[PDB]
Amino acid sequence: RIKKISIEGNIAAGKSTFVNILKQLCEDWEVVPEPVARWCNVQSTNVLQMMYEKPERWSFTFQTYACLSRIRAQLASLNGKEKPVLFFERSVYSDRYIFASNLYESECMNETEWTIYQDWHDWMNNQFGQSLELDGIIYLQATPETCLHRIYLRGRNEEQGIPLEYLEKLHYKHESWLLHRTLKTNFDYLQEVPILTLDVNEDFKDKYESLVEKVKEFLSTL
Template sequence: FSSSVLYRFASSHMNRSNEIKRVSIEGNIAVGKSTFAKLLQSAGQDWEVIAEPVSKWQNVDQTTRTADGAQQSSSNLLEMMYHDPKRWSYTFQTFSCMSRMRTHLQPLAARLLQSTGTPVQVYERSVYSDRYIFALNMFELGCINSTEWAVYQDWHSFLVEQFGHRIQLEGIIYLRASPQTCMERLGRRGRMEEEGIQLDYLEKLHMKHEDWLINKSTKVHFEHLAKLPVLVLDAEVEFEKDAKVQDDLLTKVKDFFS
């Protein structure tokens, strides 16, 4: 490539990137964020879903030096966190937030660079739920100590402010269901690491979502976050196999972001 071709490509790409709308889907564990994200992906050609990097947390690559050379192995940080939350919650939240940051910064898929409408990138969760739902909850449960919490908040604020408009959300979709319903769905999907999760943990996370997105009582550090529009969708109904419910939900989303 000549430098002028590269420049033209980069600037057209950057222009498109500036136009992207970014939306995050929030909601309790197992409420159905991935299912709903797939639904959005199939419903609009300008929509691109960036999947949550759970598998990365289940396979953290490590390189260890042995006498006969480097050896690659992997550890399951999600399992370690549930098994010994006091030891691993801070590490887990650091890693999950970093992988989340990477997904927010992911460039637009090539097919959307040509689209005539405004492209929408959809994330399952955000750097904000990492902090104001999970890390805060773990701090309140005593699984993240006050020093770790201060360190977490310091680098989190710094990174979010540094990346500024490149990760700024247009709005939030809150999939809202009772903790009992989420417990049932969690049992049905049977993710091995989540076997020990009790209803009261989901109740705490539910209240954190309610405080942040409905009651607006969570003290947030970022001014723009407090002003973000929130679309609340009833996820109590089983939307996975009901085409009518899916249509209603999609219409609400399209109206909200049009």
């Protein structure tokens, strides 16, 4: 009954910044941010920092946790909200086919880890995930260079060392999935999901009238 929209985008693209501008843009819009605050405080340890420090060792662990939390956080919000619209920061899909995938392709996860990961991911969704099916997706598109700026801009520490190559790898992944719609999944229905693509290479912190304009148009057809 509640429309479910997923906001996707490369690291530091503008998801959070954008997602906020919407939180208030209308009382009938709730947001489900990425539970990052929860991955950076696991028993006074930063697991995001641990992956970025030794990916060959922590990727699997980290990726697995990230996804688990993401689900719980989203399953969560689905209780506590006329024209209901729920906005997710990233989604289980981008978790597996963008980050997890890329980590494997980059040898940061071996056959065993990657195999387990997917089986687990499939099980999870098949289980506590049916009700998390998206009705739409908003691709906040930005070049690898721009996102790199915003990471440096945001100032989060674990990310300050991220190489443009990483950015690049994930930018292509994003594109193939959201823009071109070439990358396939195990979730058949994503093949019929609307995908609004917004170019946010330019600052929109105070120039989003257009963006928010297109968002409404998008949602009306849902």
